[PDB]
Amino acid sequence: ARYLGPKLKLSRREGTDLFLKSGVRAIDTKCKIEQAPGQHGARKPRLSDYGVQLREKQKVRRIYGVLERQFRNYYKEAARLKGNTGENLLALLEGRLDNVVYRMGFGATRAEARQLVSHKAIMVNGRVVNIASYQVSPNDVVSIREKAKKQSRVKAALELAEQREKPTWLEVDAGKMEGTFKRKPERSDLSADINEHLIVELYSK
Amino acid sequence: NIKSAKKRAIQSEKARKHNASRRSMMRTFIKKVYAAIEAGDKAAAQKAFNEMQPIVDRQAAKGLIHKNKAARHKANLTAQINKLA
Amino acid sequence: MVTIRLARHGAKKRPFYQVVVADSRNARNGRFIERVGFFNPIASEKEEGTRLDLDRIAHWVGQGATISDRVAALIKEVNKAA
Amino acid sequence: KIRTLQGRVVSDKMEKSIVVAIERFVKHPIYGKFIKRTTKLHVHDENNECGIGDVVEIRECRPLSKTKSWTLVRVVEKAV
Amino acid sequence: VTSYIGGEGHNLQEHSVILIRGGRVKDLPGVRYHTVRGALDCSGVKDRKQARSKYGVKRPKA
Amino acid sequence: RFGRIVQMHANKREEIKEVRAGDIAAAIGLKDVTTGDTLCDPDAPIILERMEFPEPVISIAVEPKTKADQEKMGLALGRLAKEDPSFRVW
RNA sequence: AAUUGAAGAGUUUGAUCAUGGCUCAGAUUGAACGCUGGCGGCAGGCCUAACACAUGCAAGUCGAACGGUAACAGGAAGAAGCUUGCUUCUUUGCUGACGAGUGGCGGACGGGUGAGUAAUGUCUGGGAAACUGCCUGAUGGAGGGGGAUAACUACUGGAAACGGUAGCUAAUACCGCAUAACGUCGCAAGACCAAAGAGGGGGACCUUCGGGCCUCUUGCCAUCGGAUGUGCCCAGAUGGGAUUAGCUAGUAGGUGGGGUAACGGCUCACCUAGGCGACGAUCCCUAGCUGGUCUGAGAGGAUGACCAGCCACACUGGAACUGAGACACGGUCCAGACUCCUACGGGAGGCAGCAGUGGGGAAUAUUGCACAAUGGGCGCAAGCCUGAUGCAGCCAUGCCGCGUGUAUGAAGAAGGCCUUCGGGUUGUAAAGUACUUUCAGCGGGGAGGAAGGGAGUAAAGUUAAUACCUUUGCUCAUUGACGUUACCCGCAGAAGAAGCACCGGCUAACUCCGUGCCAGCAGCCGCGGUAAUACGGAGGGUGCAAGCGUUAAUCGGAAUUACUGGGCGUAAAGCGCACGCAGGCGGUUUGUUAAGUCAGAUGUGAAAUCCCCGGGCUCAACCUGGGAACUGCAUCUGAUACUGGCAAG
């Protein structure tokens, strides 16, 4: 119920890298990406409209490992609120704890990030939280437990994520891991390779 | 069953034995009044009606007969005699 | 004999009550005359734990109501000067 | 004022009583077309006054009979 | 009524308390039900490792 | 558990609320108990006194009037399987 | 701020366009079944036979109503061991308490089920001819006497259940009498009706040594009102069938007597000869209704489980008693069926109350724990009882959260599956390396759910009294079923924890081998006749996930019942044609009414549920604040176009 399988095989089924196995070897090269998801993944299909909706739905799914039952809840939540459902879906999904753990750089991969979160080593706002689907509410802060701090997983996350693009709507302390999260995640502040109308069209029926 | 509030059965039997006797005491006095109305002699009808009136109002205090029923039985009698004579 | 008692709502081990005016014969969570206020016994630190409708409880006094045990105690807990 | 109807006298082949008919132009629930929905009421009145075919103010009262529970106020529009 | 016997190699006979679930067996005229294998006296299919939720074969031991 | 306790005067039921040592009583309930079972007091030292299991002898067979009673045949004889030690089913 | 909301695909033909059904893609479930299965939270868990039920419990309490005390513990005059006050015991209802009974109140509430019930009911909105324990306000009284009767006694009947006979004592039990009013009756004058005493403390007078006397607490009965509940009437709404056309005879209404808490054919007497019916009477079948649940863009369609209001039933059928209220679940009586005890004479009972059983069925649980909190009954209170309720157990049935590791890692391993056999794929997936270690396993800490109540004390009331009682602060010791709780802290270790379906098109995802219209697959179209991506087995790949499919079920898609929103020349469908009553609709002008209609106001539209901005459990499901909403309905006051009624042209 997490994913628990061979990891980059999903990235070769999606062609590009979704930064799922970043780690020490920050070059992907030992993966043979794009043209080999299986014994007959060395070709190309005509790839129907249902498929291009599903494969796009699979990519936004696989970066954060959200299962379909949990994933559909967001669509029920995004369409419930105001604004655009294309914008609301990713916005409430950015508020996931492991998403803000990754965006603040406490984790180099989401599987490495969630292992910190599920083992309750993060004191967000004054209370330690072990459930990664916790909504990190606007205008808040997030701290790390000092009595389990810096055991060579945090420092490597501090090294690599400071080479990677330095995210926007939040501030990293970078000395002793005191993350602060400030504003609403905007559509322009995204990876932008993902589409949004592919998803909300699929979830109408 | 053999619940110890089954005395309410025999507490009702001595109660009904008290009632039906005194309930018939009222009704028989109404019969004496009604017999006089079939008779038509006024003083016999008046005195009987003047006799059972304390009997009717008393059982209303004991609650065996409702006040308005006791008020009805006053209004029954005096209406019958007045139209007669 | 209309009384002012408590009706228990909520889940297991995390109770909640809303103090209600009801006919005393009827059930606890059932048929009631009027809800007047509520009470939380595990009221985590926010100031809202009880919002008792004091004036109708004072009005039902004149109508002959019997204020129950904890309902009277909650009025002694949430005083008539605050 | 008080609740009083209009009606129309229908069955006056009996004594000190009348069955009146009151018209209700209700809207149909699903089809939206107004139907002349009739309603017949056993209505009590005083001593035998009127005949058929006359609009009659009638108000609710005590259950004077098994069915008759309304009282005729007045007779309007005497005709042939 | 009638019913279809899925899989192959059934140990059915003259009298057997079995269980019946509905389903059109279109190629057979006038047969509208399926005997559910994994139930009572109609036993499981002799080894079938693929799609064993239908035909009621258990998972092989390992 | 211990559901109900009965002194059992020849399959007659009178209720016992407490049992002493050396008395015979029937415990009602007791889903998984067998013959000669050493019922001891838990959260305390555990004792044992059982050593015997007698012999079976003649095995015959049966078949009911129809197959619609075969589920009861395994059940009612299974109801008899719990009772007697020297009585097996094949 | 509170609806930012509506998709389609396959399938007739050689091919096409339509008409047109069948099927799938979605959601949902009180679900069962197959395979698999780690934990936690909130939920739900007999839909079928209202089938028959073993056992334990599901309703008692009151000594502040009373005679008494059978038990238990006491001060107590005393008894006897004899360690002369250490104790064995005898007195004794004189104390705190208290079975058995009389009496008071409850048991008509809660809890259950949906057979009956198509309208006696229910939802909605109104009314008049009423009654209403307990709780409450006001106005007064609360005088004086009597005869029995339980209990218990002496005898006695019986196996018990339960008695029967003769004596006997009390009562806030019962029965008169006095005396009545803003009360009942009566045009009036008048006539008539009630009540009970208990508990605490005590200055002083009086003590027949009880008490009276005073104060306080409470109860009592009468009348008019409040509140709450209840009975009742009326309008509309509330299923399918016309292969169900006439129906009804206390039936439709009057009058009078009686009945009724109150209204009435309610129930009789006599009279009148009527009442209901095409806007569907009567009859047959099925069904509890509603707030709402599910789906749907909406309108509608299906449905009425859980939670809440109402109604009906309590083994079947009938009747009445008692009482404030029942024609009564755990009451009575009788008839019937079915079981149980037995001494054979005679008695006993009703799980559609919580568990639990056999049975029926695809299908559903523990004879569990505590009266700690909320609520109820009785009581001054303390307390007692409470299968209501709060909790625990079993069951992935459902919803929600979480884990079975993370990173690194190429000889691109071995092995397997392929290869035009050069390679590729599985696959950085494993090993190995370094870390993290939640939940489970284990050892220690640790909330809150608990407000109260008990004894004492001070103060204000309070009264002739600093007493009592009442209120108020105040101190001490306490009240936790669940529960080795929620939560927290540390120990050892990657270590205890991943499946099920599909892969021809629909529809995301392919090869090889076996097999040859066989074995079988399949929701639809359709595949298999020796090169099968559809059959079965591997490998590969996709989907979903502690679940996943199969079946059943409802709506959707279905604008294939079309009100919104379909058609009728040939696709299914103009009666063969015509006259015509009910009924539907109706040219034009003025005046009038306001029924329909529309605008505003008012009452209500129970709560919850649903939706929005918030709050609390670490998140979430979930519990919860206010609001919106409940689009309705009824009443009231207006507007006079349009439709209708009326009058005239």
d(CA B56, C1' G162) / Å:
39
d(CA D27, C1' G599) / Å:
20
The nucleotides of chain G lying under 7 Å from a protein CB are: 2, 4-7, 25-27, 33-38, 41-43, 55-56, 58-61, 100-107, 109-111, 126-136, 174-177, 183-187, 191-195, 221-223, 226-229, 232-238, 252-255, 257-266, 272-277, 279, 299-300, 307-310, 321-324, 328, 330-332, 349-350, 359, 362, 367-368, 373-377, 388-392, 400-410, 412, 417-418, 424-430, 434-438, 448-452, 472-473, 483, 488, 490, 494, 498-502, 506-511, 519-527, 536-546, 548-552, 563, 583-585, 595-597, 606-607, 611-613, 615-620, 622-626, 635-637
Deposited resolution, Å: 4.5
For residue B45, which phi and psi values (nearest 5 degrees)?
-75, -40
**E37 burial type by CB count under 10 A (0-12 exposed, 13-18 middle, 19+ buried):** buried
Residue whose pair of structure tokens reads 């004054």 in the numeric block = A126
Whole-angstrom distance, CA of residue F64 vs CA of residue D26 = 72
- In chain D, domain spans: 3-79
- Domains of chain A by start residue, with CATH: 7-93+190-204 (1.10.1050.10), 94-180 (3.10.290.10)
Which residue from C37, C42, C44, C19 is spatially nearest to C29, judged by alpha carbons? C19
Write the CB contacts of A129 (distance below 8 Å, at least 6 apart in sequence): A97, A117, A120, A122, A123
Task: Say how many Å lie between the first and final Cα of chain E, rounded.
Answer: 41
3-state secondary structure (DSSP) of residue A154: helix
3-state secondary structure (DSSP) of residue A175: coil
**E35 burial type by CB count under 10 A (0-12 exposed, 13-18 middle, 19+ buried):** buried
Q: Which residues of F touch E17 (CB under 8 A)?
A: 67-68, 70-71
- In chain C, domain spans: 1-81
Cα→Cα distances A182→A100, A139, D67, E14, Å:
11, 4, 76, 76
- Which pair of tokens denotes residue A94? 């950015």
DSSP class of residue A68? H
Residue F78 gets the label, from left (phi > 0), alpha (psi -120 to 50) or beta, of: alpha
Whole-angstrom distance, CA of residue A151 vs CA of residue A158 = 12
Method used to solve the structure? cryo-EM
Checking chain F for breaks where C and the next N are over 2.5 Å apart, the residues before them are: none
Q: Which residue of F has its CA nearest to E40?
A: F71
Whole-angstrom distance, CA of residue F32 vs CA of residue E28 = 50
